[PDB]
């Protein structure tokens, strides 16, 4: 459909069968203004070093695949210059550029709701205990959905399109683009211990085809836009 080019830093993503992007809540990502700032130390602003489209590990799409999610910044907490600035700084303020490539043939049937959840306080099924570090901070590989139908937090996937969302309905869309600004009540927060966003690829229509069932990867490439880093400390 719409050919889209996203070029930041040394990285560039071209897509030929994408829709219009999902610039979240009508606002571009931006650096912290002076009236908005809290930390009095000067932000790092690495720009092109950390604007790179960090391509994560692609997850395989099958018929029984419930869903996947990568928490931001936890997905990029260890990857590249953004990850190094995450360990080296206690405060950050970065928006994200979500690009999800799901390359499939024209005979492939499937629809991935790519939904960016602000503060996905996830739930745990049949237990009142809060999810631990091993159930929340899965990092670069990213957690699989135990119950994506309820968005794994007691809410509904059926109402998840109020969130910044795209679809990879494989009829006329192979790639999705959601442009998130900074999303927090604080201007800046700890990247190692608070996920301001998460990206959830949920196959609301699973992979169904009657040709040779090939491996369809869901590749997540996140470019941290307008990334700012405050409180230069040691590598946490």
């Amino acid at each position: 459909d719409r050919v889209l080019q996203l070029k930041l830093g040394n990285s560039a993503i071209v897509t030929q069968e994408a829709a219009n992007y999902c610039c979240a809540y009508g606002e571009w990502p931006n650096y912290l203004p002076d009236h908005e700032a809290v930390a009095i130390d000067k932000p790092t602003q690495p720009e092109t070093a950390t604007d790179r489209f960090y391509t994560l590990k692609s997850v395989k799409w099958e018929t029984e695949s419930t869903g996947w999610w990568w928490k931001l910044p936890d997905a990029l907490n260890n990857i590249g210059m953004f990850g190094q600035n995450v360990q080296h700084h206690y405060l950050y303020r970065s928006g994200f550029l979500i690009h999800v490539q799901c390359n499939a043939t024209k005979f492939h049937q499937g629809a991935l709701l790519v939904v960016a959840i602000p503060e996905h306080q996830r739930g745990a099924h049949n237990t009142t205990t809060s999810p631990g570090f091993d159930d929340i901070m899965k990092g670069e590989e990213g957690g699989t959905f135990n119950h994506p139908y309820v968005l794994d937090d007691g809410t509904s996937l059926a109402c998840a399109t109020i969130f910044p969302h795209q679809w990879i309905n494989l009829r006329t869309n192979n790639s999705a683009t959601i442009v998130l600004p900074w999303m927090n009540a604080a201007p800046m927060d700890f990247p190692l211990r608070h996920n301001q966003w998460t990206l959830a690829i949920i196959p609301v229509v699973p992979l169904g085809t009657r040709t040779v069932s090939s491996m369809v990867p869901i590749t997540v490439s996140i470019a941290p836009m307008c990334c700012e880093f405050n409180g230069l400390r040691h590598a946490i």
């Binding site: 829709a19 219009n20 999902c22 809540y25 009508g26 928490k71 959840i117 602000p118 503060e119 996905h120 306080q121 996830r122 739930g123 745990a124 099924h125 237990t127 009142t128 205990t129 809060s130 999810p131 631990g132 570090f133 929340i136 119950h147 139908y149 309820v150 968005l151 794994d152 937090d153 007691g154 809410t155 509904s156 996937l157 059926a158 109402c159 998840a160 399109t161 109020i162 969130f163 969302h165 795209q166 679809w167 990879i168 309905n169 006329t172 869309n173 999705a176 999303m183 927090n184 009540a185 604080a186 201007p187 927060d189 700890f190 190692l192 211990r193 608070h194 996920n195 301001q196 946490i236």
Partner: protein, 294 residues
């Protein structure tokens, strides 16, 4: 953008709009919500001026309803004589938005919420079942002291932390109008994150979802009057009315029943509706109409 609309928008007259090359109802859900309006296609509308209500469904007016947040029925007797864990004529309640599922679900439609909490405390006295005789309802003066989160809370009824030299306390009678106070928007962040995808401390053993910034405080509610020879079940009902609402990043409503105050853990009912595998009560088929007119 720049819409300061105060009523529902009126529709214009629509004629036969069979124009080649353009089609409004054909949209892309893979961009967002569709912009195909009523006079554009699929209906030949008439010009009806829409004067319908919008002020009632304002997010302010949606969330400015005083709903219950703390119903605690504590006994009022000689608790110091022989009690172990029960509320010794006083209770410290961690002020959470999550105790009652109605207002919890109402505030959990939004990720971020800047509001001042109009706390109204309606306290009722009943005679406990051990006495089994009325003998009049006493006029009880109660102190509700807002302690900051993590600060020193009282341990007794006369604990000498009830002086309230710096802590803000309200003294109110049961034979009185209910205690109307306004807890400020006191979060260290610019909204209450109703959901928190993170942990409180920098250690890995922290609790998930409990940001102490969005924890409002601790309402320590006590009887200022000393003990009566008759015990009384004092049921104190704190209703919180969220006022000056500024809301951010709207969310799916909570469909499954809530299990815990602390987290968003989920377990649906044993059959639909509001079940884990089926949020909606099931029909017979796709082609079957429930409550069809016959």
């Amino acid at each position: 953008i720049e819409s300061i609309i105060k009523t529902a928008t009126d529709t214009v007259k629509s004629e036969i709009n069979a124009e080649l090359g353009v089609v409004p109802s054909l949209n892309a859900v893979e961009t967002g919500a569709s912009s195909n309006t009523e006079p554009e296609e699929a209906i030949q509308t008439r010009t009806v001026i829409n004067q319908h209500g919008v002020s009632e469904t304002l997010v302010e007016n949606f969330l400015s309803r005083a709903a219950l947040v703390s119903k605690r029925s504590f006994e009022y007797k000689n608790h110091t004589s022989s009690e172990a864990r029960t509320d010794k004529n006083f209770y410290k309640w961690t002020i959470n938005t999550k105790s009652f599922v109605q207002l919890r679900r109402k505030l959990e439609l939004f990720t971020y919420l800047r509001f001042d909490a109009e706390i109204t405390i309606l306290t009722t006295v009943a005679v406990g079942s051990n006495n089994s005789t009325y003998m009049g309802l006493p006029d009880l003066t109660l102190q509700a002291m807002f302690v900051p989160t993590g600060a020193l809370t009282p341990e007794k009824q006369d604990s000498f932390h009830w002086q309230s030299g710096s802590n803000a306390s309200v003294f109110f009678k049961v034979s009185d109008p209910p205690a109307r106070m306004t807890i400020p928007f006191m979060c260290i962040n610019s909204a209450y994150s109703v959901f928190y995808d993170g942990f409180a401390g920098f250690e890995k053993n922290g609790l998930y979802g409990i940001n102490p910034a969005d924890t409002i405080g601790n309402l320590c509610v006590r009887i200022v009057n000393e003990h009566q020879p008759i015990g009384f079940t004092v049921t104190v009902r704190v209703y919180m009315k969220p006022k000056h609402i500024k809301a951010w990043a709207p969310r799916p409503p909570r469909t499954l029943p809530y299990m815990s105050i602390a987290n968003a853990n989920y377990k649906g009912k044993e059959r639909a509706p509001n079940a884990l595998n089926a949020i909606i009560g099931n029909r017979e088929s796709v082609k079957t109409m429930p409550h069809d007119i016959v």
